[PDB]
Amino acid sequence: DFSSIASASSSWQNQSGSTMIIQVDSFGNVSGQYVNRAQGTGCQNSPYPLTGRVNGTFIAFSVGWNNSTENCNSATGWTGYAQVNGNNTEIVTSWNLAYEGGSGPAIEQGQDTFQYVPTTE
Amino acid sequence: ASSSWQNQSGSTMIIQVDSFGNVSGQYVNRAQGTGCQNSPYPLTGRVNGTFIAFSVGWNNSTENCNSATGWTGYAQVNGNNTEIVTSWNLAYEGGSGPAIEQGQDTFQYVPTTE
Ligand SMILES: O=C(O)CCCC[C@@H]1SC[C@@H]2NC(=O)N[C@@H]21
Ligand SMILES: O=C(O)CCCC[C@@H]1SC[C@@H]2NC(=O)N[C@@H]21
Structure with missing residues (x-):
């Protein structure tokens, strides 16, 4: 459960x-900060707030691509589920990125699998 | 607002948009064939200029669908009409295990709930 993730x-x-x-509370809110490093994309190396909801093993969260350091005139949402892989937990997700093309507004599709990372020294 | x-x-x-670009509100599902219909669910999201993403977990203690959906799109001003054009994913427990369905929603701006 993303409850296992609660209050930390x-x-x-x-x-x-x-x-x-990400911070998950007992009310099922997700708060956090998102550092994008994907190639081909604006808005990299700079933290973006994020908010979403968890339900059991499922999650969806959202980021708008403006934090005052860089604005990419766009937003992204992700939806997926936690699962155990080997003995790592990951979050499997599909995502959409809505942004301003030059042909006009576009919405790009994709997938992202997030691996849990323990705190390091 | x-x-x-x-x-x-x-x-x-x-939806309410606050002064920090947060989106908050509730979502009432009426799509035929789905779980969790006719019951308020928490909504949270973010906005950026004319673009937006929002998230719902389909859990409220009246009905839990074990399930969550995220939407992403943009508003556009179609004359008298304003619309939100979205794509969405719905991640849920399927019969094989967890799974993710894609779809799309156009939301029409409702002046005064008719
Ligand atoms: O380029 C933009 O308009 C904002 C950054 C885009 C980042 C996308 S969102 C989905 C995918 N996953 C990532 O960590 N980055 C890309
Ligand atoms: O059946 C479920 O797991 C919960 C219902 C999900 C409703 C989906 S989410 C995207 C699409 N837009 C809607 O207003 N309803 C469906």
């Missing part, structure tokens, strides 16, 4: 190198 |  910060990285730090 | 929306499926939401 926990960190998570995806295969494109992005990290998020 | 506060506004109501209905999508092609008859589903309804109310």
Whole structure:
């Protein structure tokens, strides 16, 4: 359960190198900070707030791509589930990125799997 | 600040945008064939200019669908109409195990809930 995650910060990285730090409360809110490091994308290396909801093993969270350091005129939402892989827990997700193309507004699809990262010294 | 929306499926939401770009409200699901219909669910999200993403976990203690959905899109001003064009994913327990369904919703701006 994402309850296991409650009342503590926990960190998570995806295969494109992005990290998020997330707080899950007992009310099922998700708060955190999202550092994007995926190539081909604006808004990298700078923390973006994030908010979402957890229900048991499922989660969905949201980021708007403005934090005052960089604005990419866009937003992303992710939806997925926690699962145990080997003996790591990860979060499997599909995501959409809504942004301003030059042909017009577009919405790009993709997938991201986040691995739990324990705190390091 | 506060506004109501209905999508092609008859589903309804109310959203407040605060001074930090947070979205808050509730979502009432009316899409045929789905769980968790006709019952308020918490909604949270973020906005950025004309773009937005929001999230719901389908759990309220009246009905838990073991389930969560995220939407991402943009508002556009279609004359008298304002719309939110979205794509969504719904992650849920399927028969094989956990799974993720894709779909799309256009939300029409509701002036005064008719
Ligand atoms: O380029 C932008 O408009 C904002 C950054 C985009 C980041 C996307 S969102 C989904 C995918 N997962 C990531 O960690 N980064 C990309
Ligand atoms: O059946 C469930 O697991 C909960 C109901 C989910 C309703 C989906 S979410 C996306 C689409 N838009 C809606 O207003 N309803 C469906």
